[PDB]
Amino acid sequence: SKDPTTFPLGCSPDITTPKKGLSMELYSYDFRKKGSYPCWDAAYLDPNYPRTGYKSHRLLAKVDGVTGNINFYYHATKGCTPQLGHLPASYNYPKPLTMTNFTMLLYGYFRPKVTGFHTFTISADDLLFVNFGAGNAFDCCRRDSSADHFGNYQAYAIWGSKTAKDELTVHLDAGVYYPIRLFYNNREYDGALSFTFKTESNENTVSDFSEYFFSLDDTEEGCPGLI
Ligand SMILES: [Ca+2]
Ligand SMILES: [Ca+2]
């Protein structure tokens, strides 16, 4: 089912070794033409922007192995102006980009260490939309066939809105691989992404996803959760 749920379905990959990290695609996000009021494009809030609209902009990069702490804060000096910066080393992308104005998609799997409830907390400047679970994000080792068919967001944050931070609480089983999709945009000026979680079992905040994000190969058979 594509609908978001407190009890998401996960995946059981075969022997082939999971690879560390998420995959990432970077895209352009231009300003409006000189003198427009305001200067930033509102396309990022088109209902279909996270599904199809982004693909009409320019592909910048496709990277594998994104893991570790994926949080960032980029400080711009000027409005209405493309300015260069770098993502943190965790993104495995060693080129500058226009950090003031870009779109980023990350996808893969989250593998828990604890069976029980997890609460992920997110915030972003400007936008972070999260899908989580088989079907809601994509299907088990069948990402290519289902990548565009994700469901209602499990959580979302939009800078400047009444929902500028959000939480998602899900019950998960240790060692199972859960499809995840993170879609981020910066429209102008500063950018920021925060993505962390806690489990109901203790007070520790987890922000380093070294032990938790993996990529699995698609297969003809699929790898549906057997638990
Ligand atoms: Ca295999
Ligand atoms: Ca911004």
TrEMBL record:
Domain PA14: residue ranges: 64-211
Name this protein carries in UniProt: Epa1p
Entry's Gene Ontology molecular function annotations: metal ion binding
Cysteine pairs bridged by disulfides in the record: 11-140, 39-80, 141-223
Keywords for this protein: Calcium, Metal-binding, Signal
Gene this protein is translated from: EPA1
Binding site for Ca(2+) 2: 125-126, 186, 188, 190
Binding site for Ca(2+) 1: 14, 16
